[PDB]
Amino acid sequence: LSRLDPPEAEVQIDRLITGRLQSLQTYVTQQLIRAAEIRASANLAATKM
Amino acid sequence: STQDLFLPFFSNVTWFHAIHVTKRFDNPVLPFNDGVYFASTEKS
Amino acid sequence: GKIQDSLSSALGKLQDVVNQNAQALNTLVKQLSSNFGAISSVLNDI
Amino acid sequence: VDCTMYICGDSTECSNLLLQYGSFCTQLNRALTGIAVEQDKNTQEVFAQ
C-alpha cells in the first residue's frame, strides 16, 4: 500500500494472494488425508470398544 | 452468497412526511451513505 | 408379516453418500468459478 | 480458518480483489468445519455405547 501506487501495485497484491491461497489449499488438503484416516483408525477403535 | 449493501431486516429508518392534505412540510438535505434506500410514496 | 409393512415406504448405510455427492457435485461448478486471486478466474484473460 | 483475515487481514481492497470470485474460502470452511463435526461424532460412538 505504501511504497508503490494502488492503481498499479494491485498487481503486487495480485500474485501475493494465490500462494497464500495455495498454502491454505495444501493445509486443508494435507489435513483431510490424515483426517478421515483417524476415523478409519477410530472405527477400529470403537469396534474393539 | 455475495457482498452487497442490503437494507437491514426491518431497518431503522426515519419517518418523514409531506402532509397538509396541517402545517407539516419536509424536504431536508440528506447524506449519501452505504447505498441509499429512498422511496417516494404518494397518491396524488 | 411384522416386517413387510415397515419395509413398504434415513436407512442403514445407503442414505449416506447421495446426500453428499449431491452436496459435492454442486461444488464442481463452483471450485474454479471461485477465486484463484487473479484479475479474472479463467486463465485466457490472464 | 477464518479465510479472508488469513489471506488479507483488515484490508478492503485486498478483499475487493477477492470477489470476482465465487466461493473458495466458503467451501474451504465447509471442507474444514465439515470434518470438525465428525471427530466429535467420532468421539460419540467410541464411548457412548
Curated annotation (Swiss-Prot), chain A:
Effect of residue 47 to I: In strain: Gamma/P.1
Job of this protein: Subunit of the fusion protein that is processed upon entry into the host cell. Mediates fusion of the virion and cellular membranes by functioning as a class I viral fusion protein. Contains a viral fusion peptide that is unmasked after S2 cleavage. This cleavage can occur at the cell membrane by host TMPRSS2 or during endocytosis by host CSTL. In either case, this triggers an extensive and irreversible conformational change that leads to fusion of the viral envelope with the cellular cytoplasmic membrane, releasing viral genomic RNA into the host cell cytoplasm.
Protein name: Spike protein S2'
From Swiss-Prot, chain B:
Protein name in UniProt: Spike protein S1
Whole-protein residues included: 50 to 98 of 1273
Disordered, as annotated region: 18-26
Annotated glycosylation sites: 12
Outcome following mutation: residue 18 to V: In strain: Eta/B.1.525, Omicron/BA.1
Function recorded in the entry: Attaches the virion to the cell membrane by interacting with host receptor, initiating the infection. The major receptor is host ACE2. When S2/S2' has been cleaved, binding to the receptor triggers direct fusion at the cell membrane. When S2/S2' has not been cleaved, binding to the receptor results in internalization of the virus by endocytosis using host TFRC and GRM2 and leading to fusion of the virion membrane with the host endosomal membrane. Alternatively, may use NRP1/NRP2 and integrin as entry receptors.
Organism: Severe acute respiratory syndrome coronavirus 2
Quaternary structure note: Binds to host ACE2. RBD also interacts with the N-linked glycan on 'Asn-90' of ACE2. Cleavage of S generates a polybasic C-terminal sequence on S1 that binds to host Neuropilin-1 (NRP1) and Neuropilin-2 (NRP2) receptors. Interacts with host integrin alpha-5/beta-1 (ITGA5:ITGB1) and with ACE2 in complex with integrin alpha-5/beta-1 (ITGA5:ITGB1). May interact via cytoplasmic c-terminus with M protein. May interact (via N-terminus) with host bilirubin and biliverdin, thereby preventing antibody binding to the SARS-CoV-2 spike NTD via an allosteric mechanism.
